[PDB]
C-alpha cells in the first residue's frame, strides 16, 4: 500500500545511535530553557510570568 499511509513507522530511529553522536552535549540536562523554546513556536507578546515549576512555587 503506497497510497495507504499506515500509522506504523517504516523506520525506527535508534536512540543509542544518538547517544553515540553526543549532540545533546548535556545541554538539555544543564538547562531545560531550551525545551520551552521548542514547545512554543513563538514567544509571548506580554510579560511572561515564567516562575519555577512547583506546587506552591
Amino acid at each position: 500500500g503506497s497510497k495507504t499511509i499506515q500509522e506504523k513507522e517504516q523506520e525506527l530511529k535508534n536512540l543509542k545511535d544518538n547517544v553515540e553522536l553526543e549532540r545533546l552535549k548535556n545541554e538539555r540536562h544543564d538547562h531545560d530553557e531550551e525545551a520551552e523554546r521548542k514547545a512554543l513556536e513563538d514567544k509571548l507578546a506580554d510579560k511572561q510570568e515564567h516562575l519555577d515549576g512547583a506546587l506552591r512555587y
Binding site: L15, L24, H29, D32, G53, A54, L55, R56
Partner: protein, 80 residues
C-alpha cells in the same frame, strides 16, 4: 551493584538520595518537579522508582530533588 565502575551508566542500585542529602523524586511522578525522563520513555535506562540513574550519560548518576528550590542534583554513589 550499589557502586559504580566508571560514571554509573549501568548503575542499577537502590540509592535514592542526592549528595546534598535530599531524597530523589520518583521518575514516574511529576510532583513537585516536572520532567521529560519518563520511565516508559527510557525503559532501557532502569528508571526505577526514585533511584539515582544516568539517562543523559553524565559523569555522576543524578536525580530530581523533592525541594521546589532545587530542580535536580547529583547522588553521592561509591565506586567499585
Amino acid at each position: 551493584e550499589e557502586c559504580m565502575h566508571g560514571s554509573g551508566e549501568n548503575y542499577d542500585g537502590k540509592i535514592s538520595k542526592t549528595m546534598s542529602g535530599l531524597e530523589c523524586q520518583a521518575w514516574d511522578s511529576q510532583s513537585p518537579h516536572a520532567h521529560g525522563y519518563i520511565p516508559s520513555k527510557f525503559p532501557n535506562k532502569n528508571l526505577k522508582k526514585n533511584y539515582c540513574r544516568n539517562p543523559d550519560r553524565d559523569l555522576r548518576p543524578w536525580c530530581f530533588t523533592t525541594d521546589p528550590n532545587k530542580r535536580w542534583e547529583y547522588c553521592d554513589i561509591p565506586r567499585c
